[PDB]
Amino acid sequence: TPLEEAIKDVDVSGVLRYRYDTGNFDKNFLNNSNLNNSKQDHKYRAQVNFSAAIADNFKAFVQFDYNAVDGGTGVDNATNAEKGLFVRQLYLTYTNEDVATSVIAGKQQLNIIWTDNGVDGLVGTGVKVVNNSIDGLTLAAFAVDSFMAAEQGSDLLGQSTYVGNGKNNNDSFKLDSIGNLYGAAAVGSYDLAGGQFNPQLWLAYWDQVAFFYAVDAAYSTTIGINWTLEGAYLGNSLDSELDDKKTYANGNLFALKGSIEVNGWDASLGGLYYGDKEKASTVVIEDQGNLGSLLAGEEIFYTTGSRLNGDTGRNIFGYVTGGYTFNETVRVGADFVYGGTKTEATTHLGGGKKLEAVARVDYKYSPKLNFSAFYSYVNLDQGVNTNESADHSTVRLQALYKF
Amino acid sequence: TPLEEAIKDVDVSGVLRYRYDTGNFDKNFLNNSNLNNSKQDHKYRAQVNFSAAIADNFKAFVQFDYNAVDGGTGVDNATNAEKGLFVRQLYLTYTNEDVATSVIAGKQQLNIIWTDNGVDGLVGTGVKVVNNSIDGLTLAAFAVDSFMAAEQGSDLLGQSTYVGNGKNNNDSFKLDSIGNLYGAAAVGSYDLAGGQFNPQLWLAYWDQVAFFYAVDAAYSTTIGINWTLEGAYLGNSLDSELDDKKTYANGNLFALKGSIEVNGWDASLGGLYYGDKEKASTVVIEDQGNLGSLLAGEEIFYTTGSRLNGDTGRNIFGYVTGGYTFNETVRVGADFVYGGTKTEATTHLGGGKKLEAVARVDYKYSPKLNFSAFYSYVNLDQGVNTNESADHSTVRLQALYKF
Amino acid sequence: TPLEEAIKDVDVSGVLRYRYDTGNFDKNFLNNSNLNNSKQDHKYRAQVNFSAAIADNFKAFVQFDYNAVDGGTGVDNATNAEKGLFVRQLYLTYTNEDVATSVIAGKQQLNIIWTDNGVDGLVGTGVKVVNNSIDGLTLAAFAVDSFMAAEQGSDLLGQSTYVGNGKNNNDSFKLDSIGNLYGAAAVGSYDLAGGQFNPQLWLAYWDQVAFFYAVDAAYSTTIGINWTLEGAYLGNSLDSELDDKKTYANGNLFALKGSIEVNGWDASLGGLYYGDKEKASTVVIEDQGNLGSLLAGEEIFYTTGSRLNGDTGRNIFGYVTGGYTFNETVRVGADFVYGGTKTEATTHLGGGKKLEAVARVDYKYSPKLNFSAFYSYVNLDQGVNTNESADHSTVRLQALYKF
Ligand SMILES: [Ca+2]
Ligand SMILES: [Ca+2]
Ligand SMILES: [Ca+2]
Ligand SMILES: [Ca+2]
Ligand SMILES: [Ca+2]
Ligand SMILES: [Ca+2]
């Protein structure tokens, strides 16, 4: 078929993202597989998605991914990525409009509350059933048979490590094997008179790991002023393979945030409570799940003992953010996060007071092209040697194009 | 050039195929590199072909292939294919319409009678000359200089193995080296009054291997009943590198099939005779060549001693098939195959009676999109321990889109 | 977005090139990593370039590369390239027309005078600033932070080797490490009354290697006759890491060529002088840089001691070329090159008189599609055993499509 013709049944979207990241560390800082260790690297992430109508009620979707690094520093003057595109997602979508339901089967980015829903979200193979028969309500069941785990490295539960006690790869949350994942979801979006309300309810059973359960709600509204409030609880109870190890513990997390917009000024205040002093627990499956609206900073929740994807210790944190937006074009702003981790100091690492300040610029050049930067300073009250404390700077420049 | 413009000299076609295969085996079953060993794997095979008019009388062709597997079972919950596209075919086509002839040079899927002509057909580099000056007759010469062997694994002659005698990789047909391939073909398609007649004659010399020669003919009829009859002989005589090894033997194969269609019922009866009791011989070069219309079942001709691409043993098999077709849309049907292999029990394995039954569903959703499934049960009268017999089940679900 | 739409902001170009090369050698020939050692190989090089307008003043560019080989001979009857596309260039271009300047940042083919500017040109990551404010003058500064070195193999300075003294990998120019590259360029194109004048001036500092400096000028003109004259000097002075090794030496090269066109006849005469009798020096960074207009033959400047990208020995060569062009369509022509290398015979290899004759056909089938061939015979007055001399033939057939 003439390509001119073939492309008419096709839709394209994607992402092009560049990153110049440099992360530094005091010798006393508790480093691990999740903190930013870039050394003036140029990083590329490109994704191109094609969706094609292939028959009545059937679309096919593919995503191509380019994930590559070029060096700057030292011997990295020869590191220059010679890489190709990889098929990252490949799946079929049956849609029946009469019953406002879709079946999506294949290798797909999961986009559940316990995984990143953006560029680097966990991908697996399985089936998703999604219903929109009710006004303002999305109902879904899903089953995953396998996970694209290698690509995710230390983003995935059970694949994070940390430094300490003369070993670079102490396992943050040992997971000897994994099963299939089964779950469901209800996700509401409603116009009250006052404004929009977004409740969410998530259940899943990950065989050999845990039964997860979560609720999250957001209210948002007008008056020229805008304010949102958002809360969430995520908990899980362990499967018996972990329960019998004795050194794991059912997860709990509480988080709340409120925020304000007026005249270009924006600000937010929020906090959260999670983990267990003595035993390993997790909040999410991959990275920080879909909880970004209930977080702040960049690095602080990657410190040892404070990671949301497996770690040991009890965490309390509060944060504030603020920024001004010149002409709806450039935003200068900052984040401040403060809190701590409690551990059993005899057996586990990362306990103590922690803080982070972040300065930010976000420049909206066009509706599709943004440039952004941040400077993050993180301080640990007690480092490798717990008597002294420890610094960790991270600087990023970023270009990001969406299409 | 604007891409909009550039694509006007371009033509696209391809394939998307999904497969959920699970193959199981009695501990007593004779396993080898060709039987189905899938363990609830999701298998993707995608091909996209672009053909561009580059100048007067010249087209260029490329094919991109994605061949990947995702796990289901056990430790395969982490196996999830992180693969890219590979250039599978790249060739030039000179066409002169005045002499109804085309010259096709490059890396190309061979599509000769001794290779699979479908998705997973053997690819090599060489030249093809094809003529359509005579009404209803296609004439061709061809020469191949190299073969895309690795991709084919055990589908290729000389690269199959089998289990037995405490060794997992007993070579089915040892081929220490290979030469170039040269051959020709005549392929007729004629409307007699009664109906269509399709004679074929194929010759080739594969240096260091064998001289192949084949004839195949099919008659089919029109209108409310329909019937086809199809026969074939494939033989080869060995090159002296194999003749002097003493343990090889010129190949012969005879096959015949007849079949009936009426009111949605269809049925077929057929049989075949091939191989040699004492010595290794082959029928085809890759997999089961283009002989699918003269076969039945799924697994039976992959049992040790019965493979069409190198094996020792003499084979006689008969088969019957049957099915009903609700609305020209869904076909439920079955295959029964029965026969045996005769060997020298002292020196070689796989001798004995063999059967296979297969249940089938074939659902034509659209002209481009088909879903199919099958359940195959294969029985070996004499297994690893030849005293007891042995089972082998295999189940497949399949989606297949052509464009 | 509908793809139909998305492709309107896009521009495509590229190259498809096929090569059947076979290079042979006397047992007495001095072989190395740069002479042609093909054995009836089919070679493919494809590049496809997409440039997209992404916002006001911003384009993005990507290049995909396919670089692959299929065998012919012996065991190479199984070598058949199973390769994919790789992202070879990925870069952003900011263009401000008000100041006739462009900033091009990313992974890009450098196209400086010291690298190949064609299909296989050295790629690195960095920034290029280019100005066209002056009539007939292009001004540029550039900085490179890393190099795509692996892809270039022995084309890159410091990665060539040679055979001799019972060792196959004697290093032609040992470079233990490399720094960043910084340079600038001025490139003129002017219509004098007589005809066009093309001066060029190139400076760069490659940290840990050398400071390079170059001038090149070309005059061309009418009188139905056409004649060009072109000269160049390339020199470099070493960085102290090489100066202190004592066995390296600042590079100098002089070259001059004049040439004639009339009635389909064309001819050229030229010569050059480079290198150092006792010590390793280089002229260019990758392959033969952009100096092809000042060279002739195919193989002779790849002989040991005569390579433009790192070698020991002093070289003088002269050459003549000539050809006739039937109908602006087919050119039959030849090259003759003659000269020598002076070395310290005690310590280094490749010294002696050398010649090359090349017969050529170049068939312009369309403005986009060319077929070409050459036969090259190279003779070394003194080979491995320096008493006897040594032959090296090289034959190429080539198809080359540009779009
Ligand atoms: Ca991730
Ligand atoms: Ca599974
Ligand atoms: Ca195959
Ligand atoms: Ca060959
Ligand atoms: Ca090169
Ligand atoms: Ca650098």
For chain C, give the secondary structure using H, E and C. Answer: CEHHHHHHHEEEEEEEEEEEEEECCCCCCCCECCCCCCEEEEEEEEEEEEEEEEECCEEEEEEEEEEEEECCCHHHHCCECCECCEEEEEEEEEEEHHHCEEEEEEEEECCCCCCCCCCCCCEEEEEEEEECCCCCEEEEEEEEEEECCHHHHHHECCCCEEEECCEEEEECCCCCCCCCEEEEEEEECEECCCEEEEEEEEEEEECCCEEEEEEEEEEEEECCCEEEEEEEEEEEEECHHHHCCCCECCEEEEEEEEEEEECCEEEEEEEEEEEEEEEEECCCCECCCCCHHHCCCCCHHHCCCCCCCCEEEEEEEEEEEEEEEECCCEEEEEEEEEEEEECCCCCCCCCEEEEEEEEEEEEECCCCEEEEEEEEEEEECCCCCCCCCEEEEEEEEEEEEEC
Nearest CA in chain B to C68: B87
| CA A356 vs CA A287, A303, C14: distances in Å | 19, 11, 49
Helix (H) / strand (E) containing A13:
strand A10-23
CA angle B188/B189/B195 to nearest 5° reads: 135
Rounded CA gap, B110 and B151, in Å?
14
Q: Can you tell me whether residue B301 is helix, strand or coil?
A: helix
A391 is in an annotated binding site: no
Can you tell me the distance from the alpha carbon of C144 to that of C131, in angstroms, rounded to the nearest whole number?
Answer: 18
C-alpha C147/C-alpha A71 separation (Å) is 9
DSSP string of B212-281, one letter each residue: EEEEEEEEEE---EEEEEEEEEEEEEE-HHHHTTSSB--EEEEEEEEEEEETTEEEEEEEEEEEEEEEEE
CA angle C314, C315, C316 (to 5 degrees): 135
CA dist., res. B168 & res. B185, Å (int): 38
Q: Which residue of A has its CA nearest to C6?
A: A12
Q: Which residues of C touch A10 (CB under 8 A)?
A: 2-4
Tell me the CB-side half-sphere exposure of residue B318, using CA atoms within 13 A: 3
3-state helix, strand, coil in chain B (%, to 5): 10, 60, 30
Residue A213's DSSP bridge partners are A203, A235
Q: What are phi and psi of B264, to 5 degrees?
A: 95, -20
Q: Give the residue from A262, A293, A266, A298 showing the smallest Cα distance to A373.
A: A298
Interatomic CA distance for residues A235 and A203, integer angstroms: 10
Does the annotation flag A180 for ligand binding? yes
Residue B79 CB partners (closer than 8 Å, separation 6+)? A146, B69, B70, B71
What dihedral do alpha carbons C152, C153, C154, C155 form, nearest 10°? 0
- Determine contact, residues C12/B9, Cβ cutoff 8 Å: no
Cα-to-centroid distance, C32 and ligand 5 (Å): 16
Residues belonging to the binding site of C are: 72, 77, 120, 145, 152, 155, 180, 286
- The pairs formed by B328-331 with CB atoms below 8 angstroms and a separation of 24 or more are B328/B264, B328/B364, B329/B363, B329/B364, B330/B361, B330/B362, B330/B363, B330/B364, B331/B266, B331/B360, B331/B361, B331/B362, B331/B363
For the record, the structure tokens of B326 come out as 């609700």
Residues A22 and A19: their CA atoms lie apart, in Å, by 10
Measured distance CA(A113)–CA(A34) in Å, rounded? 20
DSSP SS3 for A237:
strand
What per-residue string of b and e applies to C136-169 under the rule 16 or more CB within 10 Å gives b? eebbbebebbbbbbebbebbbbbbbbbbbeeeee
Residues before each break in chain C (C–N > 2.5 Å)?
Answer: 223
Helix, strand, or coil (residue B151): helix
| C143 Cβ contact partners less than 8 Å away, ≥ 6 residues apart | C126, C127, C180, C181, C182
Alpha-carbon distance of A135 to B9, in angstroms, equals: 47
What three-state secondary structure class fits A275?
strand
Q: What share of chain A is helix, strand, coil (3-state, %, to 5)?
A: 10, 60, 30
Coil, helix or strand at residue A201:
strand
Task: Report the Cα–Cα distance between both ends of chain A, in Å, rounded.
Answer: 26
**Nearest CA to CA, how far is A186 from chain B (Å)?**
26
- How many whole angstroms separate alpha carbon A321 and alpha carbon C284? 54
How far apart (Å, rounded) are the C-alpha atoms in residues C172 and C154?
10
Whether C365 and B55 lie within 8 Å, measured CB to CB: yes
Neighbours, chain C (3 or more CB pairs < 8 A): A, B
Nearest alpha carbon to residue A63 among A81, A87, A79, A42: A87
Give the closest residue to A308 by CA, choosing from A365, A252, A244.
A252
On whether the CB atoms of residues A74 and A40 are closer than 8 A, the answer is no
CB hemisphere CA count around C89 (13 angstroms): 26
Q: Exposed (0-12), middle (13-18) or buried (19+): which is A222, by Cβ within 10 Å?
A: exposed
In DSSP terms, B297 is beta-bridged to none
CA atoms within 13 A on the CB side of C290: 19
SS3 A155: helix
| A78·C7 Cβ contact <8 A | no
Query: Which residue carries 């509204």 as its tokens?
Result: A221
- Give, for A109, the enclosing helix (H) or strand (E): strand A101-109
Question: Token pair of A348, please?
Answer: 């586990």
Is the Cβ–Cβ distance between A178 and A157 less than 8 Å? no
CA of A193, closest CA in chain C: separation in Å?
34
Number of the ligand closest to the Cα of B42: 2
| Structure token pair of residue C118 | 């064609």
Q: Let me know how long chain A is.
A: 403
Distances (CA, A) of B328 to B41, B200, B263: 30, 30, 10
What residue type is B351 in one-letter code? Answer: G
Contacts of B167 (CB under 8 A, 6+ apart): none
Cα angle B130, B132, B135; round to 5: 150
Interface partners of A (3+ CB pairs, < 8 Å)?
B, C
CA distance B286 to B115: 5
The DSSP code for A248 is B
Residues in chain B within 8 Å Cβ distance of C77: 145-147, 177-180
Q: Which residue of B has its CA nearest to C15?
A: B54
The protein residues having their C-beta less than 5 angstroms from ligand 2 (an ion) are A 145, 180; B 72, 77
Does the beta-carbon distance from B401 to A178 stay under 8 Å?
no
**Are B107 and C81 a contacting pair at CB < 8 A?**
yes
Inter-chain residue contact A369 with C146, CB threshold 8 Å: no
- How big is chain C by its Cα radius of gyration, in Å? 22
Among B236, B176, B232, smallest CA distance to B205 is for B236
What are the backbone dihedrals phi and psi of residue A384, each rounded to the nearest 5 degrees, phi first?
Answer: -60, -55
Q: Phi and psi for A258 in degrees, rounded to 5?
A: -135, 155
User: At residue B378, what are phi and psi to the nearest 5 degrees?
Assistant: -120, 130
Question: Among A121, A22, A69, A38, which residue's Cα sits nearest to residue A374?
Answer: A22
Contact B62, B194 (CB under 8 A): no
Q: How far apart are CA C403 and CA C398, in angstroms?
A: 17
Find which of B16, B40, B69, B70 to mutate to test the A interface (most A CBs within 10 Å of its CB): B70
Contacts of B131 (CB under 8 A, 6+ apart): B99, B100, B101, B138, B139, B140
Measured CA to CA, the distance from residue C90 to residue A84 in angstroms comes to 12
Q: What is the 3-state secondary structure (H, E, C) of B56-109?
A: CCEEEEEEEEEEEEECCCHHHHCCECCECCEEEEEEEEEEEHHHCEEEEEEEEE
Contact C161, C171 (CB under 8 A): yes
Question: Count of CB atoms within 10 A of residue C16's CB?
Answer: 23
Q: Is A145 annotated as a binding residue?
A: yes
Question: ∠ CA(B132), CA(B138), CA(B144), 5° rounding?
Answer: 110
Q: Any idea which ligand is nearest the CA of B73?
A: 2
- Output the CA–CA distances (angstroms, integers) from residue A211 to A233, A237, A243, A286, in the order listed: 14, 5, 12, 15
Rounded to whole angstroms, the Cα distance separating A286 from A149 reads: 10
Angstrom distance (rounded) from CA B97 to CA B114: 29
Identify whether the C-beta of residue A69 lies closer than 8 Å to the C-beta of residue A43.
Answer: yes
Return the number of other C-beta atoms located less than 10 Å from residue C134's C-beta. Answer: 11
Ligand found nearest the CA of C34: 5
Q: Which among B35, B91, B102 is positioned nearest to B61, based on CA atoms? A: B91
The ligand minimizing its distance to the Cα of B70 is 2
Q: Any idea what DSSP says for residue A74?
A: G
Contact B235, B213 (CB under 8 A): yes
Short-list B304, B316, B322, CA closest to B359: B322
- Environment class of B193 (CB within 10 Å of its CB; exposed 0-12, middle 13-18, buried 19+): exposed
Resolution value (Å, 1 decimal):
2.9
Cα torsion angle, B1, B4, B9, B10, sign: positive
Q: Strand pairing partners for A369?
A: A401
Beta bridge partners of B358: B335, B376
Residues of chain C neighbouring B90 (CB-CB closer than 8 A): 44, 46, 66
CA angle (B2 as vertex; A402, B4 as ends), nearest 5: 80
User: Angle at Cα C73 formed by Cα C69 and Cα C74, nearest 5°?
Assistant: 125
In whole angstroms, what is the distance from residue C216 CA to residue C199 CA? Answer: 6
Pair C10, C37: CB distance under 8 Å = no
User: Which residue, among C245, C319, C237, C316, has the nearest Cα to C282 in the 3D structure?
Assistant: C237
Rounded to the nearest 5 degrees, what angle is found at the Cα of C87, between the Cα atoms of C83 and C89? 140
**CA atoms of C129 and A80, how far apart (whole Å):** 21
Q: Within 10 A of B2 (CB to CB), how many other CB atoms are there? A: 12
DSSP 8-class letter at B4: H
Count of residues making up chain C = 403
R_g of chain B, CA atoms, integer Å: 22
For residue C20, which ligand has an atom nearest its CA? 4
How far apart (Å, rounded) are the C-alpha atoms in residues B37 and B24?
Answer: 7
Are B13 and B49 a contacting pair, CB within 8 Å?
Answer: yes
C-alpha to C-alpha distance for C79 and A289, rounded to whole angstroms: 46
Record: contact B106-C18, CB cut-off 8 A: yes
How far is Cα A163 from Cα C223, in angstroms, rounded to an integer? 77
CA of A81 to the centre of ligand 1 (A): 20
Nearest partner of B361 among B395, B330, B399, B396, judged by Cα: B330
CA distances C221 to B99, C168, C215, C230, C258, Å, are 46, 48, 21, 12, 12
Task: Report chain A residues whose CB lies below 8 A from the CB of B38.
Answer: none
The answer for residues whose C-beta is within 8 angstroms of residue A38's C-beta and 6 or more apart is: A21, A22, A23, A394
SS3 A75: helix
CA-based radius of gyration for chain A = 22
Distance CA C273, CA C233 (A): 10
Q: H-helix or E-strand containing B5?
A: helix B3-6
- Report the distance separating Cα C135 and Cα C191, nearest Å: 11
Antiparallel, parallel or unpaired: β B123-131 and B137-147: antiparallel
Residue among A69, A33, A283 at smallest CA distance from A167 = A33
Alpha-carbon torsion, ordered A284, A290, A292, A298, to 10 deg: 50
- Nearest Cα of chain B lies from the Cα of A206 at a distance, in angstroms, of 12
C147–A78: do the CB atoms touch at under 8 Å? Answer: yes
Q: Contact partners of B by the rule of 3+ C-beta pairs under 8 A?
A: A, C
Maximum Cα–Cα distance across chain A: 72
Sort out which chain B residues have CB atoms less than 8 A from A54's CB and list them: 16, 368-369, 401, 403
Instruction: Enumerate residues preceding breaks in chain B (C to N > 2.5 Å).
Output: 223
Give A-chain residues touching B11 at CB under 8 angstroms: 1-3
Q: What's the DSSP call for residue A46? A: E
Buried b (16+ CB within 10 A) or exposed e, A333-346: bebebbbbbbbeee
CB count in 10 Å sphere of residue C207 = 15
Strand stretches in A189-305, DSSP E: 190-191, 195-206, 210-222, 225-238, 251-262, 265-281
Place of tokens 């195929």: B17
The answer to whether the beta carbons of residues A86 and A54 sit under 8 Å apart is no
- Would you mind telling me the total number of residues written for chain B in this entry? 403
Positive or negative, the CA dihedral A25, A29, A32, A36 is negative
**Residue in chain A lying closest to C176 (CA):** A75
Q: Which residues of A touch chain C, with CB atoms under 8 Å apart? A: 7-8, 10-13, 16, 18, 42, 44, 46, 50, 66, 68, 70-72, 75-85, 365-366, 368-369, 399, 401, 403
Chain breaks in chain A (C to N over 2.5 A) after: 223
Q: Look at residues A326, A324, A322, A325 and name the one whose alpha carbon lies nearest to residue A334.
A: A322
For the record, the structure tokens of A199 come out as 């409740």
